[PDB]
């Protein structure tokens with residue numbers, strides 16, 4: 001098995017910005033990796049394409065994936081509304097880490113976050129499942145549209161997404 005690679009093509013108020021790719025750690029967290037992959041291709045009939053990064057805190061993280069309520073209160077996984085914390089093997093070691101957002105134990109859906117700082121206090125409570133492969137520069141440019149309270153000054157969208165070879 002080769003870990004899958006996913007891409008997001010990011011736009012800022014509709015204007016193309018660049019591409020972020022991610023390695024997904026299917027070898028360590030296959031069930032969590034597979035949910036992100038499938039949401040990124042849209043093969044179940046729903047997913048991330050056209051969704052927004054609704055909360056961006058510079059020096060912390062970029063959060064996205066709420067395609068049902070567009071604001072951090074929604075989303076769903078490919079396995080149902082919620083699924084369990086698969087494992088906490090991987091840690092939040094620094095910028096570029098891809099990890100699941102949640103609302104308590106065993107409440108993973110579709111929302112995720114990209115770290116822009118080390119976030120060690122999240123270790124053992126959010127499932128880490130991937131990392132930025134290319135385009136950390138693009139993540140840094142997104143990040144400049146965020147604010148201390150998370151609200152973005154321009155709309156940051158996933159204009160397109162899918163799986164790379």
Ligand SMILES: Nc1cccnc1N
Pocket residue numbers: 072073074075101102103107108109110111
């Ligand atoms: N439903 C939900 C809400 C907040 C964060 N993650 C989630 N999956």
